[PDB]
Amino acid sequence: VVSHFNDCPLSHDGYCLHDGVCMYIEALDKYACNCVVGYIGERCQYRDLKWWEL
């Protein structure tokens, strides 16, 4: 679908943990959260420690 792109609502890191990157997908009219690198769990809660303590 052709939609215009806007940002995520006020509770952007609401369900999406560790400051999760909430975005809209304009093409499909869906939402998602993208996770940062070195963060683990299905919900992206935790940090992988080993690279820090190197």
**Which residues neighbour 37 within 8 Å (Cβ) at sequence distance 6 or greater?**
none
SS3 track for 3-53: CCCCCCCCCCCCCCCCCCEEEEECCCCEEEEECCCCEECCCCCEECCCCCC
Q: List the chain domain ranges.
A: 1-54
d(CA 34, CA 3): 20
Q: Looking at the domain that runs over 1-54, which CATH code has it been given?
A: 2.10.25.10
d(CA 29, CA 5): 9
Technique of determination: NMR
What tokens appear for 28 in the block? 């499909």
